[PDB]
């Protein structure tokens, strides 16, 4: 951060003249201990309605992890968000919405 | 929390009366006991009627 | 639990490491001893199903401790290498100091003493090998059969089996052998040990190894063709 990733997308937001959906990783991680899987589905649907749309997810460094802990109940929703995102992306090809854009510290 | 009888609808209101009664007919020492059920230092602190008992606690002292 | 301690005596009275030793004996090869009036027959599995194995330099499971003292074993091959070495040294020690050739019975005790010692000394595992030590006493021509256990004790049986599928072998040993009378002839005795081993090997010339030890330093391992001859004769009976 300081490489102005978000800044780039602020530029494109004006010029597109068309939807811009700016969301954060916070929204996705639990809000009822169950809200998280639902919340993945709604951003993709909402994009279709007001297409063209730019899907921008600011944080995903903490949603995407190689390993997980299923012993914490709250974590299970983190795991489920990651797996549904992979699935939806394959069904999201050949749409007017741009395929998911995300910003990270690291690849 | 003991004077909360059944629902926290009809009882949150009961408590606002109890506060009113207790201040009136001074001098008095009101002994309020265990505070643990309405303490709720947590973030999942109820915004229900449990807030109302608790707030009227701050009012008494102020 | 108490598997992390040896010093800790345990109110269960049973230290888990000791239990775990037994799991280890089971896994190993089946090794059997059956004794006549004039012989110990030791029938044992040696696996040889391994592809690209030069069989010549692969160690036979039976190892000469002494000139007339032999050992077969069930349980982990690595752990077993320590018993064989201590026991060999002590063999020659015996002669060096008593002059007397190896008393087998001393030797049974010496070996068990090591599996015992290590149960008391923390930071030393109990071995998960059970063995058969068999031999013939100084100035004697009566066969001698012993088993040791990882519980750090020893016992003598008229015939005994250890290792994988020992349950199966034990029924045979009850019905075809007797403490009261061992098969008087060497020949009888060898043929039954082949039939026992067949129950778990299920047909193999080199998978079955027979070493007969006689008195007075007579060690000879049966010829593959002769072993093959026991099998065919037995196999004719099976369909009758």
């Amino acid at each position: 951060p300081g490489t102005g990733k978000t800044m780039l997308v602020k530029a494109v937001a004006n010029s597109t003249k068309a939807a811009f959906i700016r969301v954060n990783g916070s929204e996705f991680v639990h809000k009822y201990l169950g809200e998280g899987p639902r919340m993945v589905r709604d951003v993709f649907r909402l994009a279709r309605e007001n297409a063209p749309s730019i899907i921008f997810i600011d944080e995903v460094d903490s949603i995407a992890t190689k390993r997980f802990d299923a012993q914490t109940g709250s974590d299970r929703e983190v795991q489920r968000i990651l797996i549904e995102l992979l699935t939806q992306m394959d069904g999201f090809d050949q749409s007017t919405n741009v395929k998911v854009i995300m910003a990270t510290n690291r690849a | 929390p003991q004077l909360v009888q059944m629902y926290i609808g009809e009882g949150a209101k009961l408590v606002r009366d109890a506060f009113a009664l207790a201040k009136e007919k001074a001098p008095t020492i009101i002994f309020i006991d265990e505070l643990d059920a309405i303490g709720t230092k947590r973030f999942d602190s109820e915004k229900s009627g449990d807030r109302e008992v608790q707030r009227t606690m701050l009012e008494l002292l102020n | 639990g108490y598997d992390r301690a040896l010093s800790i005596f345990s109110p269960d009275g049973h230290i888990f490491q000791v239990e775990y030793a037994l799991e280890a004996v089971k896994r190993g090869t089946c090794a059997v001893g059956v004794k006549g009036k004039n012989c110990v027959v030791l029938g044992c599995e040696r696996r040889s199903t391994l592809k690209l194995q030069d069989t010549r330099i692969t160690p036979s499971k039976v190892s000469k401790i002494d000139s007339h003292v032999v050992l077969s074993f069930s349980g982990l091959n690595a752990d077993s290498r320590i018993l064989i070495e201590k026991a060999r040294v002590e063999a020659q020690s015996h002669r060096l100091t008593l002059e007397d050739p190896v008393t087998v019975e001393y030797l049974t005790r010496y070996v068990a003493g090591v599996q015992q010692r290590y149960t008391q000394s923390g930071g030393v595992r109990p071995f998960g090998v059970s063995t058969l030590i068999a031999g013939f006493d100084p100035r004697d021509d009566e066969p001698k059969l012993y088993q040791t256990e990882p519980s750090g004790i020893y016992s003598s049986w008229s015939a005994q089996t250890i290792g994988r599928n020992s349950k199966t072998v034990r029924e045979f040993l009850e019905k075809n052998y007797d403490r009261k009378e061992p098969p008087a002839t060497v020949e009888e005795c060898v043929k039954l040990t082949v039939r026992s081993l067949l129950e778990v090997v299920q047909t193999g010339a080199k998978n079955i190894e027979i070493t007969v030890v006689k008195p007075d330093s007579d060690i000879v391992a049966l010829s593959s063709e002769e072993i093959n001859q026991y099998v065919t004769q037995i196999e004719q009976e099976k369909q009758e």
């Binding site: 299923a70 549904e84 699935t87 | - | -």
Partner: protein, 253 residues
Amino acid sequence: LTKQIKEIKEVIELPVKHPELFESLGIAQPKGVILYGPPGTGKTLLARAVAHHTDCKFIRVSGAELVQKYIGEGSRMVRELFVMAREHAPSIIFMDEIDSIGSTRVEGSGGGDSEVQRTMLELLNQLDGFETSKNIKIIMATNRLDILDPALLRPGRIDRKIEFPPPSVAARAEILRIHSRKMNLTRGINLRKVAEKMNGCSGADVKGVCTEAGMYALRERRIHVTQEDFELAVGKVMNKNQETAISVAKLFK
């Protein structure tokens, strides 16, 4: 790969269309099927493709059971998932749970995912009918066999397993060929060269080559590709795949 197509055809199409033929000529009926092999092979695609032609109702069923709120929690209404699928024969329940998640719980036996899943698996034979005819195949998809949820690992009812390799150069030639035909054909017909020279690693890899070669014609403001472009496009796509994947290692061995 078509290796794959014959192997999957036998398993799903014949018992769904006519259980009566399958049963008699063979013995028993096939159960669930587990697709394993790397990401980016296009396993999902296969599952969609069979359902298209058979006319199985591809119901994508999210691993989550909390995304279902409609008639209550989908954990508690396990039984409704069964009853309704049976009516809705022919059907493919694509129960996406990759099982990369829950690294701890593979070797464990705790966790909410383990609880719900094991009852679900038992329910199919207690209610009956999916036993009688496996017109509803429960397609699981995962990267490996060794990462499975502990309920599915042990015997139970999973039996059929189909292994997908990452493409060979032959298979790569096929995938590359057909996308190029739809798009703009590789001129000098050196799409065969490109596949012979090197292997990618996925069919996902191959669609990336397709996009880039075409983007190179766009920069010139041309609308047709040539061999020169594929030769640039391949080196860029494929090399990038290697530099992102190697960085994790320090200098061990």
